[PDB]
Amino acid sequence: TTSHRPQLEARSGAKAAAYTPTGIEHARLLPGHTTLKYRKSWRKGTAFGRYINDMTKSEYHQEFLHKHVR
Amino acid sequence: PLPTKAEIQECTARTKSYIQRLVNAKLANSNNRASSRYVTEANLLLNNSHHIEVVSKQMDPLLPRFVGKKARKVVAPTENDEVVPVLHMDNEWKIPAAVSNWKNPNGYTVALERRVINDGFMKLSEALENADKKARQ
Amino acid sequence: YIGNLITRQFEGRSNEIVKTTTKQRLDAYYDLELRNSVMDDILEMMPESIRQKKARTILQHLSEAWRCWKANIPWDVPGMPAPIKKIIERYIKSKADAWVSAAHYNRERIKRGAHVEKTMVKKNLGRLTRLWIKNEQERQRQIQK
Amino acid sequence: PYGKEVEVLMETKNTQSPQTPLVEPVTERTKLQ
Amino acid sequence: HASAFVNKIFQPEVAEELIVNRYEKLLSQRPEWHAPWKLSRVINGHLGWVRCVAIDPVDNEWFITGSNDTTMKVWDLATGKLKTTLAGHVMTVRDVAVSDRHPYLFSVSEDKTVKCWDLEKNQIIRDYYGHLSGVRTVSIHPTLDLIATAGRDSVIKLWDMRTRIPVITLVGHKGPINQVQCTPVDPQVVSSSTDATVRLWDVVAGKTMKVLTHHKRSVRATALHPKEFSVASACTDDIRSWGLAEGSLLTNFESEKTGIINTLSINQDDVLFAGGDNGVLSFYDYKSGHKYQSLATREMVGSLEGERSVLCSTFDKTGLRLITGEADKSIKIWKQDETATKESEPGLAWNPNLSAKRF
Amino acid sequence: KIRERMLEESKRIAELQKRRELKQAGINVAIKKPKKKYGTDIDYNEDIVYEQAPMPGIYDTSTEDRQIKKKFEQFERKVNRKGL
Amino acid sequence: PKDSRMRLIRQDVNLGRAVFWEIQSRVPTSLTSIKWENAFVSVYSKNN
RNA sequence: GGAGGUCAACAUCAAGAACUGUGGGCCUUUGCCUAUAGAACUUAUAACGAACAUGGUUCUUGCCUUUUACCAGAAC
């Protein structure tokens, strides 16, 4: 309780601008791609013998779910 | 009008020079020795007249450089006197309060009143009753 | 490595540390930006100034509407204005589409044999049970109709 | 659903190869090497 | 005439100051004719909302669009076919921008990242780091190898493109920034946040040239005009046009009772699109302000009622073709309807309203 | 938190009780301050901590400044002698 | 293996698919759903 | 002047089989054609190094409680 907040702001980038920086070198800021490119009978005995834009209401979801529930 | 072909060039050159000065300073303050192969390349008069010669010093490679540098937390005084005006011009939307049946964070006791055929059926059963009477006959 | 260690010795830690969005904090960041996206579109519909205490009470309908979506309970609010109910119904259909797609993708990776956590398989079973019983209820409803 | 003139087309596959580039490189000198 | 009758009797100190003069001039002013639009083809193929679209600024053969299923797609313009797909963000792609000087696709996303795609090999080259929350905006500088990005961070970052260093950070606003436009002369970055301001930045000095405070709510969409050196800023029903290098108010657009305006676009020959959150897409003359067509997007087969809203739009390079992406996860192309003349499809007949006192 | 606020309250009362007894005895123990939990933790009687000046305008505020300064100095003296 | 399994010759393919056609037609769809995707037919003859 | 240096600085080292300079003509400088002078080092079962390590990003896998630390193929 009361440690569970909906964030209702954000950390302003201006708030950390007057800080004095440190100078640790990061593994993802080493030189890489230094160059820039440029553009220029027997059948008779039987009694019976003769995209909708919603994902859950589709046929893909129904074939998935009819496969995985057995 | 569109801005003329000369002002595009003057603006591009002046701002390109500024961005290159900032990039050279950021690559020259780094601890990587490899960054200084990517940079692309005094006297001042202290009074009415004194003629000094500003020289730099050669520092020890092992002792820390920028010995004042440190990680600090700073607040900035937001200071202005430009007042700027806000130049504007000159029952249906009441949203009810939210009562949920899952969560009750402050643990209140909300009012208990608040929280909480087709014809084919008949035709099928009619045909089955007719089938029953037919089989008995 | 030793350059970073010794500069942490002489110079503290950088206070400016930001957090990369990884697998660990993705289901939280989706929530933060979903609710910002909803609250902007609802603040623009109002003819008044909302003054800001009301906003965090408006978003409780978004949370309740998502809980009603998961449980397949229809979510009618009796005295709700019409375009605000339309906005909430729009953003919940968005969240549910991403939810259903993620359930399908993770079940395919569970079938194929890919590496997967224990918690991810429990989460995927809990997602698919909702999807199955929702299909079952709609099948019962279309039979009765 | 939109009448005769307005055509709809569902699209799920890549007609171009995923390797085939979008902006094509300019080759100055013909290399026989 | 009538204004002589008013001016000789009432005697304003400035004739421009009085409201009957400023209303008689608009009736005598007579705007230009433009042709009505229509729907041409509709393209399905995303798995979420179409948040953003960009066009090839050179060859005009393909248009790319990012989306809410975290993938971008390059579609053929002329036939509508899907050429290729690009993944590499984990949350949704907010804005795409293709460079005209180098073969680079700078994409921006909600997972706090900014990426640079090569279009010669279709891979990610450069990642950028520094935004505290999810960026929603990329512009590319016309002549200086920069990127300007912005998000919920409340600042604008002007990235060097080679060393990927956040070189200049513009600290002015009081909320998330919705749009950033780059400009080659000294109002070089023009931004628009959700605190109802639009700012014109001096990027060399670091401060603001001029703050424009005329809008009442969040400014969600802006646009640069290709042949004019002026900007257009949209609000919840308030579309205005502004001059750069001074900051004037050049014209107010009669844009009332249209809802939340998500996107804007400007054709070469003074057309202004303004797609809204209520599914209504309305076309304006640029120099006048007259709204000459309104349309409604019929959404889809089993869609909802709330699911029709134009979230993004652009024009073709030749300019005769409008590309919108709506909230019903679909891409719709609009066409100038070449048949109609000035007598066949006139417009909405230009009756400016002295009431609402905005004209 | 309820329990800790009540206990800190009664702890302050005892801390003032002993000072009033020593004041009756004639030995004036000044009040010790709470200690800082970190190096730049801020004491709030030393300075106005983020003092923003009201950006003066066209009108003149010398005599009203003097009248306020008189009133505040007189209030502080009255609390010193008589005790609020 | 390919030598082992049913060798798809026109007469036997037509025969097996025909027998499934008849058996599918003998039962209504509303009772059960018999589909070709779920079936397997195997013909022994002079070619298999 | 001559030999030498476990001395320094500055150029240069992977490309239509590939270099620079000069004169003349054509276009209007760049570029094309034509005549001429020089080219050290590296390179064709292709490269300075008859030697051979590690780091980043994105794919595809392997160990499988999660992240570092990892398994081993590809592209940049």
Curated annotation (Swiss-Prot), chain A:
It is found in: Nucleus. Pfam families: Cwf_Cwc_15 (PF04889). InterPro entries: Cwf_Cwc_15. Residues 1-19 are annotated as: Disordered. Involved in pre-mRNA splicing. Belongs to the CWC15 family. Belongs to the CWC complex (or CEF1-associated complex), a spliceosome sub-complex reminiscent of a late-stage spliceosome composed of the U2, U5 and U6 snRNAs and at least BUD13, BRR2, CDC40, CEF1, CLF1, CUS1, CWC2, CWC15, CWC21, CWC22, CWC23, CWC24, CWC25, CWC27, ECM2, HSH155, IST3, ISY1, LEA1, MSL1, NTC20, PRP8, PRP9, PRP11, PRP19, PRP21, PRP22, PRP45, PRP46, SLU7, SMB1, SMD1, SMD2, SMD3, SMX2, SMX3, SNT309, SNU114, SPP2, SYF1, SYF2, RSE1 and YJU2. This is Pre-mRNA-splicing factor CWC15. The lineage of its organism: Eukaryota, Fungi, Dikarya, Ascomycota, Saccharomycotina. The gene is CWC15.
From Swiss-Prot, chain B:
It is found in: Nucleus. Present with 1670 molecules/cell in log phase SD medium. This is Pre-mRNA-processing protein 45. Belongs to the SNW family. Belongs to the CWC complex (or CEF1-associated complex), a spliceosome sub-complex reminiscent of a late-stage spliceosome composed of the U2, U5 and U6 snRNAs and at least BUD13, BUD31, BRR2, CDC40, CEF1, CLF1, CUS1, CWC2, CWC15, CWC21, CWC22, CWC23, CWC24, CWC25, CWC27, ECM2, HSH155, IST3, ISY1, LEA1, MSL1, NTC20, PRP8, PRP9, PRP11, PRP19, PRP21, PRP22, PRP45, PRP46, SLU7, SMB1, SMD1, SMD2, SMD3, SMX2, SMX3, SNT309, SNU114, SPP2, SYF1, SYF2, RSE1 and YJU2. Interacts with CLF1, PRP22 and PRP46. Interacts with SPP382. The chain holds residues 56 to 217 of 379 of the full protein. Involved in pre-mRNA splicing. Associated with the spliceosome throughout the splicing reactions, until after the second catalytic step. It comes from Saccharomyces cerevisiae (strain ATCC 204508 / S288c).
Curated annotation (Swiss-Prot), chain E:
It is found in: Cytoplasm; Nucleus. GO terms for biological process: mRNA splicing, via spliceosome. WD repeats lie at residues 45-76, 88-118, 130-160, 172-202, 214-243, 256-285, 305-335. The keyword Metal-binding does not apply. The keyword RNA-binding does not apply. Its main location: cytoplasm. Present with 1770 molecules/cell in log phase SD medium. Belongs to the CWC complex (or CEF1-associated complex), a spliceosome subcomplex composed of the U2, U5 and U6 snRNAs and at least BUD13, BUD31, BRR2, CDC40, CEF1, CLF1, CUS1, CWC2, CWC15, CWC21, CWC22, CWC23, CWC24, CWC25, CWC27, ECM2, HSH155, IST3, ISY1, LEA1, MSL1, NTC20, PRP8, PRP9, PRP11, PRP19, PRP21, PRP22, PRP45, PRP46, SLU7, SMB1, SMD1, SMD2, SMD3, SMX2, SMX3, SNT309, SNU114, SPP2, SYF1, SYF2, RSE1 and YJU2. Interacts with CEF1, CLF1, NTC20, PRP45 and SYF1. This is Pre-mRNA-splicing factor PRP46. It comes from Saccharomyces cerevisiae (strain ATCC 204508 / S288c) (Baker's yeast). The gene is PRP46. The chain holds residues 93 to 451 of 451 of the full protein.
UniProtKB/Swiss-Prot annotation, chain G:
Functions as a scaffold that mediates the ordered assembly of spliceosomal proteins and snRNAs. Required for association of BRR2 with the spliceosomal U5 snRNP, and the subsequent assembly of the U4/U6-U5 tri-snRNP complex. Functions as a scaffold that positions spliceosomal U2, U5 and U6 snRNAs at splice sites on pre-mRNA substrates, so that splicing can occur. Interacts with both the 5' and the 3' splice site, as well as the branch region. Has a role in branch site-3' splice site selection. Associates with the branch site-3' splice 3'-exon region. Also has a role in cell cycle. Component of the U4/U6-U5 tri-snRNP complex composed of the U4, U6 and U5 snRNAs and at least PRP3, PRP4, PRP6, PRP8, PRP18, PRP31, PRP38, SNU13, SNU23, SNU66, SNU114, SPP381, SMB1, SMD1, SMD2, SMD3, SMX2, SMX3, LSM2, LSM3, LSM4, LSM5, LSM6, LSM7, LSM8, BRR2 and DIB1. It is found in: Nucleus. Present with 468 molecules/cell in log phase SD medium. The MPN (JAB/Mov34) domain has structural similarity with deubiquitinating enzymes, but lacks the residues that would bind the catalytic metal ion. This is Pre-mRNA-splicing factor 8.
